[PDB]
């Protein structure tokens, strides 16, 4: 049996009082990871090569995820059965070196570690013909699925409350990669086309986006004994809300009281990202991110995001170092023009089973500090039925109430373990 | 650690629209498997031989099942802890080669793959003395348990709504097998006696079946480089409803509104089955089933079922083939004399890690087509309290409403993976 | 992959009728284990040494628990994700042979097998520096966490029903062990200090205990080819209710109707324990316990407990024996002075993969008998709101109703498997 996974777990305290807290800017889709994670998360994989004959082989892989709050010993939970697929390599003579697979599978995800941000991820149930050799590069083809909670109607109503049927969305993906545009660099290009796939007779709301596009282009340059990635992405409509490759063409959301409300995503998104990790000499390592994301919706509720941070590691011993992370966020509401922002600074002393910023297990002892000043928030007060502004960006003092995290401070500290195997 | 299991997973589309659908005749207890399965199901076993001394050994086995809808990546679920038992072989000098075991264990199940139909299965918590050598054959003894949701009353009421206590049922099993009645053939005989085991003072409903019998006789003949099984079974009363060896002597069911209703199973069942797989030459393999099942209940709500289908595999390469399945069902209501029926035809191109119809992993790409015409259905409209005909067979247009699947068509298609290890 | 666990599973019957029952004295915190367990419980561990360099190594461990009722095959359940931690040994040059760890981990538990009683157990999320060599003995340091369901208020109310916020408690532990006070004996000493850690601004009830102490001293003497432990413990206030090392300084409980009620634990506890297992010759083994526990609360609802039992094993063969267990309990209510008591006698014939009372797998076939006479019970009738005596000790006939198990008899029997690996 093969055994792999990821897991993080720990214990912490908040400067002001009680269990530890985590800090994320209202409107941003991420937080600066170090000494700013508040869960025990864990994926346990058990795979195995079940048959081999020369070049031909069949591999079986599975994944079961657990997420608990780590406030107690016995903590019951509903695990997620995230992957169970079979991949057969070299089984098709004519297209050599390629694989065909079917089943639930995490499929070629692209992410940014220090902010735990996945920027191109279409995993889920699916199937595909992977790694076909096109000479100048490798070309892969796949189809995956997602399905939104409700959003379709059995008959034609004018009442959004009748659109409660789960609505399926398909994604068709095509990538061309490992092209050496330059010396040291490579270029990957991909096209994603998604669409809500309606049951015979069902109907979507009026004006629902329905389908959409995501265009990705990623360049990898080898540098300072490490690397640098520069991405640029462009999304359209039903692909703007998730923004990783998955489609939500129905435009209907739901309150905690089962009331349907309208999230319509016609619009577009533009992403410009650059991240990497470089080694400078023998005693330093350092990861870094810089991103600007702009979701512009017709519905006028989009946002414009900016981030930057760096994680420099300095090594006393081959297995003892001092890590430091500094991050800055700033989100501006499309609807109101206000701006929310924050900055965090963490200081940690770790012991890892490695000599790299990328090596783990790791055992940290840290201290984090954050100061934010938010001037807007989302209005989730009331009910999708009571409230008409339900789920819209609204200023910090809108109608004498108060939205957003405010303008304060805080510091937390503790011990943590993190590890991929 | 030992690692074994079963798992199936995939992606599909319905000709008419949306996610894929599966087809099963109303009244039949099975569907023709190929390109007609709509879940990600998976059992993960982790066992181990914990002690051996010569002939003596102690084996530890466990099983944990997962079933999700494969419409998304993160799909939480409550797993079933299905087996955790210990078997010790040769530990009793006097009866050599035999095992004694205790714990939850799948125990000697007999099924029919293409229709995924288990026809003799009494697994659950239990214990037994297995494989005693009686000279002309092997004789095994076991006791397993089941318990129905409610069905007993603390005091004597006349109101069925007072019969809500979980009611336990025990099964006592005896089999005599591996007897060579003829050359190439073998004969197994088994007797099952089950009964509801009431708590001190509790009482069952008036007229409740209470106990019952299942008699099995299975002949296996070696043929065409494969085999053929011919079964004949006979059940009585509290063994007719489940019809695999488990007992339900209480006769009380429950609506989705927690209202008790009366399912009384006094009557009998007669099963005549013949299935097998044969190889004809070097380029063809083919599985086949033929069955006739008649449940006759006093309560007049039984049914009379008929099935036939064949799955012929033709192999282009030692690892690439074209499979085809064709199935026919026809169920007639005891209560109304009407008949429901259907026929399915699937065509698939697979790649397996084998050269057999029985070998897997397998990766299929298929298309299925079905046409049914149902003339009756079960009335589950209303409430066990609102409705008096709750859960009874009723014609297709009974009281202007409509029961059954109707008289239509459909075709689906997709990709799937399936594998036992 | 490393694979370990514990698991017990089986099938049983009650003399009087139905599934088997288990017997525990009202007020006692344990039952005499043999042929007196009614669940399928199982922990499945999968660990692994992920990196080693000479003396230095990093170990990864995990645990997932399942508990089902064994009344059926398919039994769904919510598993508990109990441990996921990383321990790195010898990573700190200056303090050699010591480990530093972080994550959810079972940490140095001390228990009493025949009564399944854990008397010093602070496991949960946490971190620590383990096994520092202090010359005359080994000194370890750790901090673990727990959190009670509710018990804090956002503002200052006088209504206990406003104290519904989960309230966290930290524990700080220090032990000094492996000191050879005498020849053959050793001495461990430990101090535990726990306290509810309130969020900025939240408040506890008036008079809430808040914090507390647990003092442990355990002496182990090597004897009769086995051993003997003699413990003495002393707890104070917020450590008296759990009484194993975990803190509950809030004093607020909840009915099944979400109504807060007051459990206040100011008081103290005194524990005197002596247990062990000895071998006498070659044909006998025998475990034994003797304990006296007195929880004295200001609130006057404490109890005074007494137990004694012995489990003598006599071995026919190196792998076939006859086990016997005899236990006696007697609890007296602090509030009413009444006394509850019981005695059990079990007789079993087992087959184990060992020659010891401590060796398993084991497969038992047994019969148990118990006779009790309880004269008081807890009043859980009504609601924390309806009832004012909710949850208090009350005599057996208080207000014409009836509390406690009464004065009866019973006998059960069956087969079971049990195994740690
Ligand atoms: O295994 C490689 C991978 O390990 C780590 O990624 C894990 C994350 O740490 C963990 O939070 C989780 O990520 C989730 C994202 O937060 C969320 O945006 C969404 O996409 O679901 C994710 C769950 O899959 O899981 C991943 C891995 O399963 C590490 O951060 C990565 O650097 C590394 O690529
Ligand atoms: O492992 C041998 C076994 O593998 C396959 O059987 C699995 C079925 O595919 C799967 O559906 C499931 O069967 C369930 C039945 O549908 C149901 O009638 C009832 O009896 O519960 C069953 C769950 O145990 O599980 C089995 C195996 O666990 C394959 O179909 C068989 O040919 C083969 O014998
Ligand atoms: O693995 C060593 C350990 O095995 C056995 O202990 C298990 C118990 O049999 C099992 O009931 C369970 O114990 C629970 C206690 O009943 C309860 O008081 C509380 O502390 O939670 C416990 C769950 O951890 O689990 C343990 C082991 O996980 C055996 O009894 C012991 O002798 C032995 O030390
Ligand atoms: Mg659940």
Short mmCIF file of C-alpha atoms in Angstrom, two decimals, chain A residues 14-16 21-28 31 36 327-331 339-345 368-376 396 403-412, chain C residues 200:
data_model
loop_
_atom_site.label_atom_id
_atom_site.label_comp_id
_atom_site.label_asym_id
_atom_site.label_seq_id
_atom_site.Cartn_x
_atom_site.Cartn_y
_atom_site.Cartn_z
CA UNK A 14 -5.00 35.10 21.75
CA UNK A 15 -3.16 38.02 23.32
CA UNK A 16 -6.42 39.61 24.60
CA UNK A 21 -7.81 33.73 16.37
CA UNK A 22 -7.05 34.02 12.73
CA UNK A 23 -6.94 37.18 10.56
CA UNK A 24 -8.39 37.68 7.10
CA UNK A 25 -9.27 40.90 5.23
CA UNK A 26 -13.02 41.21 4.45
CA UNK A 27 -13.25 40.86 0.69
CA UNK A 28 -9.91 39.10 0.12
CA UNK A 31 -4.89 35.07 4.50
CA UNK A 36 -2.56 32.30 11.13
CA UNK A 327 1.70 40.39 4.36
CA UNK A 328 -0.47 43.19 3.09
CA UNK A 329 -4.02 43.21 1.74
CA UNK A 330 -6.23 45.91 0.40
CA UNK A 331 -9.70 45.33 -1.13
CA UNK A 339 -11.42 50.32 0.95
CA UNK A 340 -10.59 47.63 3.48
CA UNK A 341 -6.99 46.71 4.31
CA UNK A 342 -4.66 44.97 6.70
CA UNK A 343 -1.08 44.02 7.42
CA UNK A 344 0.32 41.06 9.37
CA UNK A 345 3.78 40.24 10.66
CA UNK A 368 1.70 36.86 15.07
CA UNK A 369 0.51 40.48 15.02
CA UNK A 370 -2.09 42.18 12.90
CA UNK A 371 -3.65 45.61 12.57
CA UNK A 372 -6.64 46.21 10.21
CA UNK A 373 -8.96 49.12 9.37
CA UNK A 374 -12.00 48.00 7.40
CA UNK A 375 -14.46 50.59 5.97
CA UNK A 376 -17.14 48.34 4.45
CA UNK A 396 -19.15 50.38 7.87
CA UNK A 403 -20.32 46.17 8.96
CA UNK A 404 -16.77 44.94 8.58
CA UNK A 405 -14.09 44.09 11.13
CA UNK A 406 -13.58 47.64 12.27
CA UNK A 407 -10.30 49.28 13.09
CA UNK A 408 -8.31 47.34 15.68
CA UNK A 409 -5.37 45.21 16.70
CA UNK A 410 -4.35 41.86 18.09
CA UNK A 411 -1.59 39.37 18.64
CA UNK A 412 -1.65 35.58 19.03
CA UNK C 200 -11.68 39.35 25.96
#
